[PDB]
Design a protein around this ligand. Structure first.
Ligand SMILES: C/C=C/C/C=C(\C)[C@H](O)CC/C(C)=C/C=C(C)/C(O)=C1/C(=O)C=C([C@H](C)CC/C=C/NC(=O)OC)OC1=O
Ligand SMILES: [Zn+2]
Lengths: 89, 1111, 53, 49, 49, 99
């Protein structure tokens, strides 16, 4: 399990993140899902921050680090003839 | 009549239709309250049988319960779905982007078998969307419309394509269920059977029957007459049940050691275990009705049965013997026949309730395989249903349905009619349904069972003809998803009033009359012979003894839009189709006049559009304004209807509602009390009433163009408001935080004069292309300056101002007042997406006049961009100096077969000037069967000729001959319906009388300003170095292959090289050419294109040595 | 509506002076399997012993 | 595949022209110095205008 | 049908040894960029994966 | 072969590309599947955007930043290791992968 989780930390994002940031982000994810089931709504930034003993400033930074790149080859129009790359100034 | 606030629109209809047009949004609202289980549905079901009414959610849970682990020692079960009230009212949802929803509570229950307990809770199941009063879902503030869908109902289907190469009829069969595995029982070219099961390419039936628990002797017995059966059973070359079971297996899946005993379950687990194979309740009903098996008992246990398989095969063989009827053992004999996969008796209609139930099912399945997953990983005697149930897959499934699904569309609301007609839409394409290309030319056709159900006229004229229909006026969806239809059951030639909703199948069994049949005032027919619609759609004369069902009324075969086309039965289906598709595109004018001539539908289908505030309970107006009406009911309680004033539609059109009553008036319940966008006094009004001639004037109205009087522009007779929603946000960047404020980098004070003290513009300030709608600045960091820039900064002594300037400048070619600003703030605690602090939207409006290029078009398909806006004086005027408003062309009339425009024109002139049939000596002959109170009609008096029962041509001539004069002794229109127009430009009269009349013309939503576009140097794509694409940005028009062919055929080489090198891709070519133009030098010689270099590196990346060679 | 991106690199635009360039040495390195590779280093710079050629 | 079960677009698919078994349209480059609009008949113009 | 490719390799100065690929080449980084839309999101080129 | 691509194309020859050429185009074995340092947003060494191989992301600027003008061009900072040159050589250069 330790090898497989190490691998899932290293080789699973297009922009690699070190392991410890992956651990903090997964803690954030667990706390968000469980606090969703409990609060009934998705909790707030300050709420999760107070919950993980970190700053509500830092929580947004972690959330920004945890955004995966959207592909540049998903045909944007329903009539599929324009890659998404054809619309970035 | 029958609607209290009605304007008295006299009507030419000769018939008295028994049934009134239904609740036009029932197809949406009843479906959804089905899925809820509202008490309204609860009672409506009981009102017509419905042994066990079960809400959609109830059905999903009753097919999910129980949830049992592999051990079966512990059980989870659901029940009792209940909705609390919505969390946000409609308007506030639409405002704050809250998706109008409501929570689900589901009383779960966990039971352990080994010890015996219950863990019963009230689980929260997730915010569930909720249909508004208009049958439209609001989503993220937007207003969406789940579209009804057509599919082939899962059942047993039968066809025989003749193999002329053999000259034998090849019957076949497909038992296609809602979900599971197919199976065909063919009859091969050779006199055998083909039993491809679950797409495994080959089987004789005897193999399956033996695997099914039959012996060869048993099969011989059960198949007595069965010639080909006994033949294949002689060549079946496999004996013993286990013997094949292994055949089946082995080929069931290739590459697996069979357990001959154990794979038995696999069979009894593809077709019978009711968890992986379930032709739904529709499927079971359909099969039991086709084979007449379970004729008189309720339907359930959707999985197949050995009786079902054997009955299918026997019926197949009798079909490939030549038969009339098969009598299954224990079942009523049913007619032996092949099926049509287009006929509406087999092409069901998954309404919105069905769609939402499918998504909830596909969510609950994932939830099931997390319940039973963690059902064991958790510790027993410790779990609670709250810990077992995970709702996240359910909520994700729903939310990804309503958003991002090609049946969950933006409500196409650019007028009440389009709002009404997007609902009531049947779209054969979609998930589950057949796609576009994969759909051949067959289904696009109009099978003769579409009559009275799916209007054959209305459909998108693009590349979706047939794949998108709208429902008939009177149709109604069968609880199974079929499209029932009303009829008047007639007995003995005695037309009753027992309105029967015949479905799509049982219509065939009967013989169906016509609504315009000469009833003898009592239900007795008049003539002996009557038209009738026989089974396959063939037409005949039967004497009045067989006719047992007559149409409820004419125009039953026509949709909601097409019912609003006057004189529809004169126009050809091409132009009537184009008219019904351009009648959903008028834009709500500022003045909204009602039309001189119409049908009946302009009122009923205008209060059913939703966009007309309707008096809820009969009362008296207490106080009005342009914003609210306060009706004092009869007993105490009051109510204040809040007008929507200038709400942006989903396509940029205004949505005013001004009230149309006074402070002392008395309104009845169900009355119109506030016009909508295109309503005038309640009824539809999609355009104006414009005096029109039919002469070709000076070539300007050449080939579908139009010339206009300038009176339209002066008096604002055609003038649409438009309201565009501009939006920018302040994000949190790595370098710093974006900031919205007047503080801007190098910039005048004039261009920052209109902004307030805090960025955003002032409500009311006129803008133009290039103004600062929201001054918004972001940090930039540092870049090594250009030393020339540093010298200039020195000489002027200006700072760096490392904040970069990204403000919300109004895009190109837009102007007009700024109606209102809606500003959000993370600081003010309003929720926004992450990495966002301040979301500001700047509603802008502009009052587009009419103008040449715009696309006016009548109600009869006759369209055409405005050609020229003549001044008012040089417009061919009548003898009273009255100019003509527009001037259509004649050469567009005949060859399009839309003389509906001409008949409307004449009848409109009659409706305008007012007539007075001289009943001095009795009544004239043409008006013998005109309705009364049409002998005299006031000037400017509206009329209405309903669609297939309207003014006959004789009635038109008869009216037109007496068309009482205007102010002098002046009958401006001679009996033929024409006049001696005086030329306005030259001065002489025209040598021949020209037709004039009042033709009701709309203003289609293809305005010029929404189309014009130009680019000289704009943005550029990131990945490829080409200009960007589409009017959203600047972009430039495509230069495809066909244009390359054309410009080569001319032999123009240099222009082609230009267009492909230094206008698209030559990266250093672009700046060089721009420099060359600006300085006045010679345009340099273009370099190698960019796409070539990219293609070259891709090829070299594929390990393909590509190498230019000089010499 | 517009959506702009940006590669994470600035674009300095001087003129490509071909004459006034900082003078520079050449250090020929060898890999293990008898490969000769050459590297223009700046003049005043300790020519590093190893290198990922 | 990636998300949404859309197959990743590899090098064999990035070839710009790349006709497959059936000949589809090229559709080109989107030139600059362009622009469209709706047209209207101009009966006072000369033939070359 | 075999002589086709066989004479192809013979006549030319190629060698069929090139068919088995010993070292994969990498397309330049710009032709498979990783641009960031404004607002932190990234847009890869689907070849990076 | 005229790789500089200026107006002279008498032929355009194709051919199956052996490894002895594939590793001759390339400007350095990329040997780490690293795309960008999550926070600084610069290319990783030996990654699929490695400036040391593919080129400089900033016009005439090494990675360590010890060279920032055209006066230092064609040379390679011996500490960071990047050819200080125009920022469009990231459009032309290729890397290989020693299987
Ligand atoms: C380097 C070439 C390798 C072999 C070619 C391959 C693999 C291509 O797959 C087929 C050729 C092709 C298509 C490439 C498209 C490129 C480079 C590109 O991006 C375009 C483009 O998409 C369209 C155009 C023109 C508008 C096409 C006009 C054709 C006219 N034909 C004619 O005149 O009739 C005789 O130029 C381009 O450079
Ligand atoms: Zn450096």
């Amino acid at each position: 399990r330790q090898a497989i989780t190490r691998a899932m930390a290293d080789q699973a994002r297009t922009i690699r993140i070190p392991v410890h940031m992956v651990e903090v982000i997964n803690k954030l994810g667990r706390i968000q899902r469980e606090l969703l089931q409990d609060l009934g709504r998705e909790p707030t930034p300050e709420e999760l921050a107070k919950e993980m003993d970190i700053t509500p400033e830092k929580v947004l930074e972690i959330q920004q680090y945890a955004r995966e790149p959207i592909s540049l080859d998903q045909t944007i129009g329903d009539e599929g003839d324009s890659q998404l790359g054809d619309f970035i100034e | 009549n029958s609607v209290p606030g009605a304007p008295n629109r006299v009507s030419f209809a000769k018939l008295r239709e028994p049934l009134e047009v239904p609740g036009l949004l029932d197809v949406q609202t009843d479906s959804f309250e089905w899925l809820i289980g509202s008490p309204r549905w609860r009672e409506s079901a009981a009102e017509r049988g419905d042994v066990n009414p079960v809400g959609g959610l109830e059905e999903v849970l009753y097919e999910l319960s129980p949830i049992e682990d592999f051990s079966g020692s512990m059980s989870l079960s659901f029940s009792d779905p209940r909705f609390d009230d919505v969390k946000a009212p409609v308007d506030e949802c639409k405002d704050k982007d809250m998706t109008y929803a409501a929570p689900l509570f589901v009383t779960a229950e966990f039971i352990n078998n080994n010890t015996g307990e219950i863990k019963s809770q009230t689980v929260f199941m997730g915010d569930f969307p909720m249909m508004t009063e208009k049958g439209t879902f609001i989503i993220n503030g937007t207003e969406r419309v789940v579209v009804s869908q057509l599919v082939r109902s899962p059942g047993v289907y039968f066809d025989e394509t003749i193999d002329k190469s053999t000259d034998k009829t090849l019957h076949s069969v497909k038992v296609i269920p809602s979900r599971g595995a197919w199976l065909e029982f063919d009859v091969d070219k050779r006199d055998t059977v083909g039993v491809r099961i679950d797409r495994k390419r080959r089987q004789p039936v005897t193999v399956l029957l033996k695997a099914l628990g039959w012996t060869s002797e048993q099969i011989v017995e059960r198949f007595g007459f069965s010639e080909i059966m006994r033949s294949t059973l002689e060549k079946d070359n496999t004996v013993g049940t286990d013997e094949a079971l292994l055949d089946i297996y082995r080929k069931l899946r290739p590459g697996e050691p069979p357990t001959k005993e154990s794979a038995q379950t696999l069979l009894e687990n593809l077709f019978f275990k009711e968890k992986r194979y379930d032709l739904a309740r529709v499927g079971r009903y359909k099969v039991n009705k086709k084979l007449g098996l379970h004729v008189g008992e309720p339907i359930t246990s959707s999985t197949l049965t050995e009786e079902d398989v054997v009955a299918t095969i026997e019926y197949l063989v009798r079909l490939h013997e030549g038969q009339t009827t098969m009598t299954v053992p224990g079942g009523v004999e049913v007619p032996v026949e092949t099926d049509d996969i287009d006929h509406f008796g087999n092409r069901r209609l998954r309404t919105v309730g069905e769609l939402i139930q499918n998504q909830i099912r596909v969510g609950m399945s994932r939830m099931e395989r997390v319940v039973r997953e963690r059902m064991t990983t958790q510790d027993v005697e410790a779990i609670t249903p709250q810990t077992l149930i995970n709702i996240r897959p359910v909520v994700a499934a729903i939310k990804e349905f309503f958003g991002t699904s090609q049946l969950s569309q933006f409500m196409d609301q650019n007028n009440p009619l389009s709002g009404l007609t997007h609902k009531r839409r049947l779209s054969a394409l979609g998930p589950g349904g057949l796609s576009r290309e994969r759909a051949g030319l067959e289904v696009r056709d109009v099978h003769p069972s579409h009559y009275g159900r799916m209007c054959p006229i209305e459909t998108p004229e693009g590349p979706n003809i047939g794949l998108i229909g709208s429902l008939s006026v009177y149709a109604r969806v069968n609880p199974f998803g079929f499209i029932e239809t009303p009829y008047r059951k007639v007995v003995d030639g005695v037309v009753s009033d027992e309105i029967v909703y015949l479905t799509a199948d049982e219509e065939d069994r009967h013989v169906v009359a016509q609504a315009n049949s000469p009833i003898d005032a009592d239900g007795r027919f008049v003539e002996p012979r009557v038209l009738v619609r026989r089974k396959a759609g063939e037409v005949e004369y039967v004497p009045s003894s067989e006719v047992d069902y007559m149409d409820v009324s004419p125009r039953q075969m026509v949709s909601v839009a097409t019912a609003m086309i006057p004189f529809l039965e004169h126009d050809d289906a091409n132009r009537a189709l184009m008219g019904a598709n351009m009648q959903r595109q008028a834009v709500p004018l500022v003045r909204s006049e009602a039309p001189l001539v119409g049908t009946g539908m302009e009122l009923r289908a205008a209060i059913d559009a939703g966009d007309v505030v309707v008096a809820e309970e009969s009362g008296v107006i207490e106080e009005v304004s342009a914003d609210y009406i306060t009706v004092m009911h009869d007993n105490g309680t009051r109510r204040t209807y809040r007008m929507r004033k200038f709400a942006r539609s989903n396509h940029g059109t205004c949505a005013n509602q001004c009230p149309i009553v006074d402070a002392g008036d008395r309104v009845e319940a169900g009355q119109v009390i506030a016009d909508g966008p295109c309503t005038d006094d309640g009824e539809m009004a999609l355009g104006k009433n414009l005096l029109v001639a039919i002469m070709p004037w000076e070539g300007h109205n050449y080939e579908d163009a139009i010339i206009l009087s300038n009176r339209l522009v002066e008096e604002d007779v055609l003038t649409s408001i438009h309201i565009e929603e501009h939006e920018i946000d302040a994000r949190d960047t790595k370098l710093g935080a974006e900031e919205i404020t007047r503080d801007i980098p190098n910039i005048s004070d004039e261009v920052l004069a209109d902004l307030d003290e805090r960025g955003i513009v002032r409500i009311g300030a006129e803008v133009r292309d290039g103004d600062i709608l929201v001054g918004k600045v972001t940090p930039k960091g540092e870049t090594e300056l250009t030393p020339e820039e540093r010298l200039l900064r020195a000489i002027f002594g200006e700072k760096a101002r490392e904040v970069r300037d990204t403000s919300l400048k109004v895009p190109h070619g837009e102007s007009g007042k700024v109606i209102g600003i809606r500003v959000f703030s993370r600081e003010d605690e309003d929720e926004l997406p992450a990495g966002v602090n301040e979301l500001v939207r700047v509603y802008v409006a502009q009052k587009r006049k009419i103008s040449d290029g715009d696309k006016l078009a009548g109600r009869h398909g006759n369209k055409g961009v405005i050609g020229k806006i003549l001044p008012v004086e040089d417009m061919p005027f009548l003898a009273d100096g009255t100019p003509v408003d527009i001037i259509l062309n004649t050469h567009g009339v005949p060859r399009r077969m839309n003389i509906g425009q001409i008949l409307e024109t004449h009848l409109g002139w009659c409706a305008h000037s007012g007539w007075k049939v001289d009943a001095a000596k009795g009544v004239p002959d043409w008006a013998a069967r005109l309705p009364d109170e049409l002998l005299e009609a006031q000037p400017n008096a509206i009329v209405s000729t309903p669609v297939f029962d309207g003014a006959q041509e004789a009635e038109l001539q008869g009216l037109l001959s007496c068309t009482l004069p205007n102010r002098d002794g002046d009958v401006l229109v001679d009996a033929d319906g024409k006049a001696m127009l005086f030329d306005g430009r030259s001065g002489e009269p025209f040598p021949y009388p020209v037709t004039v009349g009042y033709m009701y013309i709309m203003k289609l939503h293809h305005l010029v300003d929404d189309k014009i576009h130009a680019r000289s140097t704009g943005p550029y794509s990131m990945i490829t170095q080409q200009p960007l694409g589409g009017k959203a940005q600047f972009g430039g028009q495509r230069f495809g292959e066909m244009e390359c062919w054309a410009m080569q055929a001319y032999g123009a080489a240099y222009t082609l090289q230009e267009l492909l090198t230094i206008k698209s891709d030559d990266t250093v070519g672009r700046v060089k050419v721009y420099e060359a133009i600006v300085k006045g030098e010679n345009i340099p010689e273009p370099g190698i294109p960019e796409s070539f270099k990219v293609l070259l590196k891709e090829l070299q990346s594929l390990c393909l040595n590509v190498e230019v060679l000089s010499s | 509506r517009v959506l702009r991106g940006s590669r994470l690199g600035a674009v300095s635009y001087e003129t490509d002076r071909n004459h006034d360039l900082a003078p520079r040495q050449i250090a020929r390195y060898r890999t293990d399997n008898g490969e000769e590779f050459e590297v223009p280093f700046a003049d005043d710079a300790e020519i590093p012993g190893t290198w990922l050629c | 595949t990636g998300p949404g079960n859309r197959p990743l677009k590899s090098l064999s698919d990035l070839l710009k022209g790349k006709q497959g078994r059936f000949r589809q349209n090229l559709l080109g480059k989107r030139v600059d110095y362009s622009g469209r609009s709706v047209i209207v008949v101009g009966p006072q113009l000369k033939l070359h205008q | 049908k075999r002589l086709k490719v066989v004479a192809a390799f013979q006549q030319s100065g190629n060698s069929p040894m090139g068919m088995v690929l010993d070292a994969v080449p990498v397309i330049p980084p710009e032709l498979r960029p990783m641009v960031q839309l404004d607002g932190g999101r990234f847009a890869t080129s689907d070849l990076n994966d | 072969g005229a790789m500089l691509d200026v107006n002279f194309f008498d032929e355009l020859r194709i051919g199956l590309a052996t490894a002895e050429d594939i590793r001759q185009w390339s400007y350095g074995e990329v040997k780490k599947p690293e795309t960008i340092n999550y926070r600084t947003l610069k290319p990783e060494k030996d990654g699929l955007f490695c400036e040391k191989i593919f080129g400089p992301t900033r016009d005439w600027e090494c990675y360590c930043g010890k060279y920032k003008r055209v006066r230092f061009k064609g040379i390679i900072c011996e500490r960071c290791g990047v050819e200080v040159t125009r920022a469009k050589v990231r459009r032309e250069r290729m890397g290989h992968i020693e299987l």
